[PDB]
Symmetry: D2
Subunit: 497 residues, 4 copies
């Protein structure tokens, strides 16, 4: 059968010659019998001194860790990034230092709202997270399959996640929550139009693009800084699943994406993505018609063309899923010198959110789980102890800074880039920014007639389950985007109602 | 629109008169604005001073707790147990003390292998766990929808659970693991025959029976002990979903059971169960043809009739799912005086397994989560502290026993019943016990022709995905049960393999 | 016998009439016998079904939580704050709203570096943390017994804490670490001079002052803001322990402060503190000779007089130490409307550091441990779940914002005060700020001859154990403060080294 | 200066030639400046963008783990055990398999009741825990400096521990609790007499003996079983501190034992212990005048002589205290084939108590913290996942047993020895066992006049702080042991009162 079906057979075939290992306890003590327990006679009660049973049973009882608060259902793979073009005039990061340089990568794909156990082929944004193991530490590009997101302020993210998830009382998916949140926040129209198009259900993880979706800052060796976007487009082509096909697959094969990626890598059909950047100077960031740090906007390709950088290749399947996929952690704040953060508020909130959730989910010392370790860099600092400190704890080195005993020193060349900001320190309302121009451009100029009609059908078929007043508010926003948009959606809703 | 769809509308309607509450932080400080963050200028970076954002963000980051290692996907409800018949001659537990007395209950239904997010209408055993809030402490009857289980020794339970879950490398369901484990352990044939019949997919949680699968010990006020089984049959009738209907429902409505139970309770259609016991004397346990403490065997009804006890009724929906259903914990060791454990090895392992996993999953002080608290009895002991110690940590009372300062004292009437056992202390092999007699009885006498044909078709349609040698071993076990069983399964496998 | 010695006798005396409680398990099941375990025969092995022993033992195995990373050794008490003067022109916080208003408080005193188990009467700064339970949420004033601290940048705090604690290899106190850090960072001279004076060892917790030590921002109802300091001076008088007396007490009574506070409150001798503020306008902050947000500086009293505000009274002893003292958590970010943070970098770091460490030490839901709960305010937000959720989890209320179903709304009057800042966003060096002027003022004008000579003796007696080059660097800093300071310390060091 | 105080100087001297390391974050990213934070101008507020500060600060905030519920204050060392005599007729354990074989060991010394920060030189029992790294798994001999203990039933251990610690309200040491518990349970008289003698305060950890204190079962290769006791006597000699000297040292040097052990090993003065066993046949365990599995009784030397086995030597100091001493865990259930548990009820309770508390204190995967790992054995079983799994999660091997794919198998030779027991299954009262015979033997025949007088003075000076009726009950128990004992204690109490 398929290589995923033959995992145990393949393992047995590689271990055909050798004799089976001796079964031991967690402390290495050999086990005499692990099929029966110690009782007082044949029909008597169990004994405490059966420590083999207790040792196995307690560890079984402690197997689960909390799942991710979002993107719980996921698939992992490994490979490398290779440089194909020179962009050293924009960035001085070691990952781009010369043409042909290779950096090992780790990649996790995921959905957003479904828990670990839900189906892969549902309408949802897709996570595309890449971990670069560079000599200047780990670089995490925690991206999506869309260049934009629903909201533009990080304080609304927990509310959006709650509204996309189950009702707090009935534990059911509630369209009222979803559509009340979306109609009260019309800045989500762009990503809603993206989500309900054909690209909302990709045909596996190999047939979709990846976007960092934030503005980032590139600094070169001379100290000059530019703003950038990150793109990586699939070399396999964009492929999508129809609504009926996805509905069938969700029942027949709830793990469609995992099986597809594993069977592709196992047969040597390695998927690749071509890595691009967009570049915006500060002067033309001043004159951009929108806010260039707004997560609901893209940079048009005519004014900001793609610049090739390299390519991402995935050629290795995980050996153990729990150790390499479930325990992997991506922190957007993991940036080497040459890559920095832009003043995008969403990115600013993400700078705190991810290590904070990783400490809770995995542990304070999660950075030295082997899949998360920066094994191509040298870690030396004044941090000590913590639960599950699996090292020499940096030995007997001095643990305070500054000192006069030869402990590690700071590197002045790794200093951040300086920007002067104007304005007072307060909360600025961004709910009334431009919400319809790029949505109108997508509706009129990007989609053709059939894609547009399918998008309207999908929106109506999801929105018809909500209350009437939420329907009117959503239709009002859609009519603000385009009158035909709202009118078609309202006609389909009238048919449903 | 069903009442489940109108949850927010109903909540808004009960609060029509009142003005909305003031939005505060976790420390109660009122919040000025929670739609925008604090930046230096309109297009500047974020400030640490925005403690409102950090306070909400970290709590959102800490929302998830580890799911149950088994029975992760579940549905909760609440109600009461009522006594309708007198069994005081068998047990002295306060829950059965007189006819007509009521005890509040909490119930969780669940599947077994699927995690959170998996579908409800799949072929699986169903959990039926009942928590009695009794004045003599909490009593947990952690039952299933089948009277039997796959294995009879508790040390094989982690291996069986692993074999029914995802492959450790590919993270996929692996028929090889499932059927290799089942063919290497032929004592699972009885529960496999149960599982692949029509009752493997119940039509919601209201149309299925509940069984305390282990044998238990009942002690009366005179110190006499008997062995017992627990049954509670649905008053709604047994109803099952066909394979095609369940397949359609799994993708159309993955939360079919939760919605069904909630909409039943919300409309006033309260599901009910009739509570029964089987009773075996110790002489009858000596003369029983099998081991009476074997989890792969039942007590036949013609020799051990059902004795009515009471009624289980569920009439209240959960108010908050996470606090009442996700955080509820059932410990089989929670037994009041009058109810004890039998020497069933599975039950003995479960006596340790559940509080240990509860301490891991919820916390050391999980017993004082409000849904888990024994609020109808009085807690007084010499246990102190631990993480999240609420109330007053039993005040300044003496924390050592014995003492001379009026601290709580042991109650001699609550002493366990004493039994003399014979034999050596070692591991006794039970893999070669009788594995086919009751399976043959179920195959020949219980099922009719159509149910038998569907059972064979289901078994073949699952086993076809396994390797050839595992197929032959499983067919050998089925032929050991009955020649026609194995012959039909092999013929269907031959059709599938070509 | 003191009342602390008679705790158990008193508890027995209040329970003279009533009969002792029944000893139960954690689930409320009555215990037959808790002095012997279940064995097969008198000389046989232990049984799993002895669940009483397992429950008690497993709970005993989990009663330790991690201690505080600093201020581990501490003492707690409770009382109230009362307003005696009108400061409504400066702040609109409800805690100061009218004269005579009372607010319940909780107070923890502590040392800094010693772990839970170390002695009380050692040379160290003392923590003085006050938690106000106001109707606008909880307000925590996490203060010290000194108005200043050793460093002025929050990124050096873990290094300073490590240097004051045990060596990473030998696990011993290492004067090399302490004095190398202090000599490499000359900004610590002011707080070092404070620490090695007579007030470095107070005579219990009732004979010492308390300082917020940070500049804070007070905003009134009209939107005008001022900068403020917080003071609360002991009404019992400043009293200190000599070096020899403290050394004797450390081994004779390692819990001197706890016993002193408990016996004071138990006999009705309630300690009191008078609450003051200093007020700086923004123009005065512009014209201040130093940085007014520097943690190594004080505001001189002749230019910024004390303004009386209120009264802190402690009159209730803790009932259970672990529940009310070990589990209490103070967050400087807990500020009601009318009180805000200043741009002091140390305060900015603390704003993140304290809830972050509370989530790890106590749990994500630590704010609803009863001693930490804002029980005089109404908590309503969109935060849900988390481990050990011990309420209705806010029921079935909508959990997203904004919504259209009557869920809690933001309060616009609780918005923060707005300030425009100038300059680039980068790291600014503050190591070369003024380090010796206020230290010289303290050395020359505050201390008399005997206090000065004792201070020099204490400094030399601690610094003698360090290496020679660190001794020269420290002596160089002391000579920078004053030539006689450094010369006296060097002469005493010369005597010690020979 | 002692070598302990020159730790940083020594580290700097071994790192004199090399250049200092570059200071990085936990993810390996080089740090530009770690002395100042990022603010909005010289006097502005702090930025979230300062991820270096947050990364260091959160880890500092997560440094502490819960201390041990008992024996919190401790000192660690490392070395080896060597076989000097042949006892293979009693045991088939690989650790004793031939003369001259070495096995690496890890040792922790500790007090009992004091927490971290408390003084070393106080009157208390001393823990002497030895971890053998054996090719048949790890063997932990969790011993004490006394052959006996206060109680004989494991269900009273939490009550005794609570009574020896702080009052639940005042958080102070309460003599009422201690002496009420001791007078209500007169089986503690033997260990109380031991504790209040001169050996209650050892002169460091090198001048004291070690005892397993339990009866254990030794099984040879032919299946024959015997009962045994474990002894290891100090080759440095028994040395004790006087009450006044210990009181002075507690104030002056609260870490006297740690410094003494470290400076002994650092200067090459390696402490050693001689390893002995007592042997009781199953026939003569029936005719023993007491219960041979009673923790309040010893086996007399004239009837059960010591049999030499080997030497315990400590020659290596810890490199990092937290990783090697604070995180080390000893499980009495860690026993290789050839060593088993006896029906001692205290040992049976300890079989459950220690792994249960280790899972809470350190983590579910505490057995693979490097100091706890059985690195000289091969670990292979069907346990998977759990928090903080750091090696491979045993790869893609089959995780269920039995299987048909070559996974590890049980070893029938490692089966336990089987014993038939008689009697009912219930709770048997052991409070009325013999409580005074061996105490009387110790009082009359072991101690001389001066030691006896000092013991009486110490007991009186501790008991005078308790209430009067507790004093009478304790005096009644002491008079039961010997009339002169109780009369002297009562006269001293009368002087105090
Ligand atoms: C029923 C009786 C006992 C129980 C339940 C018990 C329980 C415990 C527990 C929970 C710990 C904490 C371990 C850790 O957190 O690392 C501990 C430590 C310890 N116990 Fe016991 N104990 C008992 C009696 C004894 C006896 C009889 C001995 C010696 C003969 C002993 C010697 C020790 C030692 C040396 C340690 C420190 C181990 C280390 O250095 O990590 N205990 N005990």
């Amino acid at each position: 059968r398929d290589p995923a079906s033959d995992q145990m057979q393949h393992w047995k075939e590689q271990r055909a010659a050798q004799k089976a290992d001796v079964l031991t306890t967690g402390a290495g003590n050999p086990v005499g019998d692990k099929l029966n327990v110690i009782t007082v006679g044949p029909r008597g009660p169990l004994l405490v001194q059966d420590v083999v049973f207790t040792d196995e049973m307690a560890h079984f009882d402690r197997e689960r860790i909390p799942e991710r608060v979002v993107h719980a259902k996921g698939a992992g793979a490994f490979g490398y990034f290779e440089v194909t073009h020179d962009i050293t005039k924009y960035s001085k990061a070691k990952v781009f230092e010369h043409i042909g340089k290779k950096t090992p990568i780790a990649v996790r794909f995921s959905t957003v709202a479904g828990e670990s156990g839900s189906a892969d082929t549902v309408r949802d944004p897709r996570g595309f997270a890449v971990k670069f193991y560079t000599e200047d530490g780990n670089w995490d590009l925690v991206g999506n399959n869309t260049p934009i997101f629903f909201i533009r302020d990080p304080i609304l993210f927990p509310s959006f996640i709650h509204s996309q998830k189950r009702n707090p009382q009935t534990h059911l998916k509630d369209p009222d929550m979803v559509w009340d949140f979306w109609s009260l926040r019309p800045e989500s129209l762009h990503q809603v139009s993206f989500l309900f198009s054909d690209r909302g259900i990709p045909d596996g993880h190999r047939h979709m693009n990846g976007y960092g979706s934030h503005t980032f800052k590139l600094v070169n060796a001379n100290g000059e800084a530019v703003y950038c976007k990150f793109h990586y487009k699939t070399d396999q082509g964009i492929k999508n699943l129809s609504v009926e096909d996805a509905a069938r697959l969700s029942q027949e094969d709830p793990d469609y994406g995992i099986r597809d990626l594993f069977n592709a890598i196992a047969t040597g059909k390695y998927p690749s993505w071509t890595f691009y950047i967009q570049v915006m100077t500060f002067n033309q960031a001043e004159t951009f018609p929108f806010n260039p740090f707004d997560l609901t906007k893209v940079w048009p390709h005519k004014d900001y063309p793609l610049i090739p950088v390299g390519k991402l290749v995935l050629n290795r399947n995980p050996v153990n899923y729990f150790a390499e996929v479930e325990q992997i952690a991506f922190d957007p704040s993991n940036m080497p010198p040459g890559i920095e953060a832009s003043p995008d508020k969403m990115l600013q909130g993400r700078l705190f959110a991810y290590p904070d959730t990783h400490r809770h989910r995995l542990g304070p010392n999660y950075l030295h789980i082997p899949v998360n370790c920066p094994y191509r860099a040298r870690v030396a600092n004044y941090q000590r102890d913590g639960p599950m400190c699996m090292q020499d704890n940096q030995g007997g080195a001095p643990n305070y800074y500054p000192n006069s005993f030869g402990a590690p020193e700071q590197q002045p060349s790794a200093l951040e880039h300086s920007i002067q900001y104007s304005g007072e320190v307060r909360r600025f309302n961004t709910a009334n920014d431009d919400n319809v121009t790029q949505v109108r451009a997508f509706y009129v100029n990007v989609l053709n007639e059939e894609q547009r009609k399918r998008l309207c059908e999908n929106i109506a078929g999801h929105l018809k389950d909500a209350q009437i007043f939420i329907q009117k508010k959503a239709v009002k926003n859609f009519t603000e985007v385009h009158p035909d948009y709202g009118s078609h959606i309202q006609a389909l809703l009238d048919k449903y109602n």
